[PDB]
Design a binder for this molecule. Sequence first.
Ligand SMILES: [Ca+2]
Ligand SMILES: [Ca+2]
Ligand SMILES: [Ca+2]
Ligand SMILES: [Ca+2]
Length: 255
Amino acid sequence: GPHMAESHLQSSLITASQFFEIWLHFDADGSGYLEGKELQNLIQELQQARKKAGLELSPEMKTFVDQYKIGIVELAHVLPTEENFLLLFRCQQLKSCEEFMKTWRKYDTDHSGFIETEELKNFLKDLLEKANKTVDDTKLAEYTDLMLKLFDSNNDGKLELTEMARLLPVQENFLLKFQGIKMCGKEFNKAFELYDQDGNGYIDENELDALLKDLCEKNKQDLDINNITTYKKNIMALSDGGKLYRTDLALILCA
Ligand SMILES: [Ca+2]
Ligand SMILES: [Ca+2]
Ligand SMILES: [Ca+2]
Ligand SMILES: [Ca+2]
């Protein structure tokens, strides 16, 4: 359990289940990030643990302690995480927002608007096979279960776009700025109808640009008109060949 983290920080190599217990030990509010007292507790306990183990700090541990709000992905690279689990965070599909949006569309194969366990399993299996690793069904089931528990913020047993997007670095995750912009179904449906200006049933890139300019204007504290081109490019990656249907735009704007 999370109490075992003190023992885990002394390990030569940390299993995915151990990394999960470390995360839950320090993340006292379950917010998905270590900050303030939680981060200070990690810095103190990581150094005390390697000392108790009679070990030196690895180069990544030295660089982390020297330069310290950090998330789950950053912690996985600092610690001696087991190889096949750490490989799941060294994907260009989780480093570029545009490539992550294409990955979401690729792996939501039942068009449910969520990534369910079996879809997440297929994504992780494909990442491992791309790295030439032979997948063991038991460990893959364990990795999938732990990745879901780490990122399923609302505990509904599946991932929504904003949950899985937290695998991205803070700078690429534009969805953090769209948090308080999300609308209910009725209001969203009214906006979709307004912004489909030619009335052909979908929103194209020119129509999305008008939408994004209007959203920037009404949410000055959250969005930035100078990043419209990036917002446009990220959102167009969820489209069906340049066509944003109601369910595609709902992923970004509907609560
Ligand atoms: Ca926290
Ligand atoms: Ca799905
Ligand atoms: Ca969820
Ligand atoms: Ca249209």
